[PDB]
């Protein structure tokens, strides 16, 4: 048995974490894992070709463009590979999810609410007037899970007294630190009126981009509360800095579920024809400098 695990962004430690747990599944269940990075449609196509050359019987993929769904499905079928998605759900030409592809991702809207609640609570601890705070929304709205994460955060912040008029959309060219850094700088330039800011994106990587941009403009840790999603090494790098940064916290996700449980679901689908769960939406909890080590250890991460 051989299973492919194809990821859009190998330089995001979340996917490295999925891979590490998928490797644990491989050793445990006695299958061979083939790890492939595919940050573009061209590289997805070659990844699936490689997996077929190696006689893999299944592939789990977080595609770089969810609209590649139909092509991915057609090739996997041609090559006799069962197909499962992780993180980013594959969709058809009208943006409807592929009904025959089992998926595991996060409960994105609820996770976003947690981001906004975390931010609101820290702002309150600092005595900030929420009605006067700039709300930097790093946006990559073309991807549903990203849109839902930021919508939840905004909704939680408005529920806590942050002003709709102070929500500054910062649309990203790419959903990565570079994209966020550039989008944040554009937003800060237009909104020099705010003294205090909060920021968030789709993940730790994007969030940190805004924190770095703020630092370059004299918006440091006292004037910035930013909370990410993943709780992997980008969050941990901020938490380990000798001087705390404006990256205040992150919603810790569980890459054992996304890496180990998906791989087992695939294994059992291949070997026993067990119907995979069609949709699993996972949960998270807030980590900050104060609890990150404990929280991660209590998940075995
Ligand atoms: O499912 C969680 C993952 O979702 C992806 O869209 C994102 O790129 C990852 O960094 C991680 O947040």
Best of 87, 201, 205 for a ligand 1 pocket test (most atoms within 8 Å of beta carbon): 87
DSSP code, position 225 = E
DSSP code, position 277 = P
**Domain boundaries of the chain, sorted by first residue:** 1-106+254-283, 107-253+284-301
Q: For Cα atoms 272, 91, 263, give the angle at the middle one, nearest 5 degrees.
A: 30
- Domain 107-253+284-301 listed as CATH 1.10.10.60: no
Structural determination approach: X-ray
Best of 206, 229, 253, 283 for a ligand 1 pocket test (most atoms within 8 Å of beta carbon): 229
**CB contact at 8 A, 21 and 256:** yes
**CB contact at 8 A, 199 and 150:** no
Residue 230 annotated in ligand binding: yes
Residue 169 annotated in ligand binding: no
- Closest atom, ligand 1, to C-alpha of 12: 10
CATH number for the domain whose boundaries are 1-106+254-283: 3.40.50.2300
- 86: which strand partners? 104
Model resolution, angstroms? 1.5
Q: Cα(145) to centroid of ligand 1, in Å? A: 8
Q: Cα(253) to centroid of ligand 1, in Å? A: 9
Q: What DSSP letter does each residue of 128-173 carry, written as one string?
A: --GGG-EEEEEE-TTSHHHHHHHHHHHHHHHHTT--GGGEEEEE-S
Spatial CB neighbours of 248, under 8 Å, sequence gap ≥ 6:
118, 119, 122, 225, 226, 227, 288
Q: 271-280 — which CB contacts under 8 Å span 24+ positions?
A: 271/1, 276/84, 276/102, 277/102, 277/104, 278/99, 278/102, 278/103, 279/102, 279/103, 279/104, 280/103, 280/104, 280/105
Q: Is 88 in the pocket of ligand 1 (CB under 6 A)?
A: yes
- 281: which strand partners? 105
Return the structure tokens found at 125: 């601890």
Q: Where are the beta strands (DSSP E) in the chain?
A: 2-7, 32-37, 58-62, 82-86, 103-106, 134-139, 167-171, 197-200, 224-230, 247-252, 279-282, 285-288
- Closest atom, ligand 1, to C-alpha of 146: 6
DSSP code, position 97 = B
């Amino acid at each position: 048995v051989k299973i492919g695990f194809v990821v859009k962004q190998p330089d995001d430690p979340w996917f490295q974490d999925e891979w590490r747990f998928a490797e644990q599944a491989a050793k445990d269940k006695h299958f061979t894992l083939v790890k492939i990075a595919a940050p573009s449609g061209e590289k997805v196509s070659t990844a699936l070709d490689s997996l077929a050359a190696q006689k893999a019987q299944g592939v789990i993929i977080c595609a770089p463009d969810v609209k590649l769904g139909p092509g991915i499905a057609a090739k996997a079928k041609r090559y006799g590979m069962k197909l499962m998605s992780v993180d980013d759900q594959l969709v058809d030409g009208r943006g409807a999810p592929l009904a025959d592809v089992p998926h595991m991702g996060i409960s994105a809207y609820r996770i976003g609410r947690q981001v906004g609640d975390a931010i609101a609570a820290e702002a309150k601890r600092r005595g900030w007037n929420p009605a006067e705070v700039g709300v930097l929304r790093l946006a990559y709205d073309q991807l549903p899970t990203a849109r839902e994460r930021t919508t939840g955060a905004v909704d939680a912040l408005k529920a806590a007294g942050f002003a709709a008029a102070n929500v500054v959309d910062a649309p990203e060219m790419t959903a990565d630190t570079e994209g966020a850094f550039n989008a944040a700088n554009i937003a800060f330039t237009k909104h020099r009126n705010f003294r205090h800011w909060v920021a968030f994106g789709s993940n730790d990587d994007t969030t940190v981009g805004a924190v770095r941009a703020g630092e370059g403009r004299g918006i440091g840790t006292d004037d910035m509360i930013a909370v990410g999603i993943n709780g992997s090494q980008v969050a941990l790098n901020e938490f380990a800095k000798p001087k705390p940064t404006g990256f205040f916290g992150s919603i810790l996700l569980n890459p054992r579920l996304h890496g180990y449980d998906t791989s087992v679901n695939m294994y059992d689908w291949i070997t026993q024809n067990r119907t995979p769960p069609p949709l699993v939406l996972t949960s998270g909890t807030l980590i900050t400098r104060a609890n990150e080590k404990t929280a991660r250890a209590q998940l075995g991460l």
